[PDB]
């Protein structure tokens, strides 16, 4: 055994030792309990960043910990290969997105292997290979025949300069974020997943997830947005029926979740596309300009509530069905066409959104709810205004004295007898649009025939192979310009027909990759029935915060879809969720000659804070998440080249808990490396003074007071580490517990015979307790202390007797 810790000399050897033993290559062995530990598979952007290393080290700790406890652990790895970054790099470097992707995959796979992750590489998948996406095309055709996937027209943002479709997040003040040209609203036929049919099932099944974070389940409930309310019809006044046709000339229909406050309605609001808005705007240019501004808006629902609410009066009036009040109709910008009736009622006294709207335009506020002896202030909103639980009705005539649910049914009874309303359940959830006007994505298995319509590609002719010999030019997506691709024959009649040129949303690949890992080479279905039965569902999921709501919802949707097709048996894909915190770092900038700032990477600077090149001082700015925005990203390959994989893994797990943000620190990295030097020195000095012995075990009566205390600290540390790994999922404190154990070991005389046995017992446990964190040095140190296989010795057991005083 060498005297000095040198990770470059032991880490390649430890990996080949695990590779030859094939401890990470697992099968459906019924003689062992299974454990599926899944980390979110990376996008092949070119090289790993710090978020990758932290995510997959967290997953490797939980995987190696469960492996030492006898579990048959599957920890797979793949590549979320589709996306736009390959197209943009293709337009910059003039290469093909496929070749650019496959090279990034090979390089990043070498980096992941160098980190020593216990990964079953025989289950590796790449979503851009036809061997993978052929099965999401298959499920598309099956759900298309059933109607779960359908085709309808939708509105998109067209950039006429870049000749591409943009999302609302890429539109700023009505212009494209790159071209700066005014976007155009176009209606094109697209494909949709009828996810609203599974809304009740997606909402109720959240109760089965006993181990999910309550805030994550709450975000799923809000996005689905189930509400039990009331449909209410306000009769249009005789002096406001001009220009209206059909039912819109008779009544204005609205939906409300607070029918107990129907007596407190002071005005109604309609969307810009509502027929009442169209009729009143026929002779009013202000209303026409307001309607045009609402239609030209490009607000994302993540910023919908942050939008300033605006409205215009119409001069048209409707009649409240309960008290007969005449209420003026307003055109509001927050009322969305397609959401319910496209019209709402307004109660400013018990809805803060209506309170701010009425206070702006000085609209009346009528109180109809009372909570105790609390005073009602018409010029200041209070939280109890919207209380549905402890409220009682006032200023409501016959409805006075009733609570929420009694007034709900009583209002329902009054409206149904008049034929002016009935209860209704609504959902904020929209259907899932999957059509993307991009090249680098999974093709849509639809052929357009003028005599047969939109016919699905039969299962024999799948996949619809995306051509890889394509270099995007920018002026339009390539698929719509390649007749050699879209010109084909109709699979129903054999006549001339055109393939679908749009590609699928990349969320589709991530909605079922956890099932493909179970049988990645299965060619008769999405997943074999044998492997799905054994592995069941993912026991532990580790990923980031980005797009968590949509990804989880889509993955839970695909699970129930595949279950209904008879492919899987579970109702939920993920039993446990661990979302890691971001990695932040300090930023550095030097002021410009044009009134700006140029941001410098931390690798090109040294703290005296001075630039590393010209030696001119550079401003050290604030800390934020590593990104190419302010050039603050630290390459983990430089961290591995300098200290090794074990130091990188240890610093990640020790600097902060997994959920908390990790702040980059050069001193913290050195401290992790010095501890690995200390651990190597401890084992080396122990073996230099006599070599290994048999670890102490059994009855400890007769040991000295000093040696009994060390065994107490030892088996107390083992209990604390097991709780940190298996329950708390707090790996930083577990490293601190082992450090305290080594501290007391240093202060203890282990020179006696039984003292050497206690020392052997202490060291054999410490290297096994840190094996999930730093497996390379622990495997190397374990072979010096004991001749058995580390994974066969298992997780260290707690000696209960070593705790009785
Ligand atoms: Mg349960
Ligand atoms: Zn045909």
Author numbering: 1 to 608, 618 to 814
Q: What is the paper's account of this structure, in its own sentences?
A:
To correctly aminoacylate tRNALeu, leucyl-tRNA synthetase (LeuRS) catalyzes three reactions: activation of leucine by ATP to form leucyl-adenylate (Leu-AMP), transfer of this amino acid to tRNALeu and post-transfer editing of any mischarged product. Mechanistically similar to other adenylate-forming enzymes, the class Ia aminoacyl-tRNA synthetase (aaRS) LeuRS charges tRNALeu isoacceptors, which are essential substrates for protein translation. We have solved crystal structures for all enzymatic states of Neisseria gonorrhoeae LeuRS during Leu-AMP formation.
The mutant was readily expressed and crystallized, and high-resolution structures of the NgLeuRS-E169G apo, and soaked NgLeuRS-E169G·ATP·leucinol and NgLeuRS-E169G·Leu-AMP were determined.
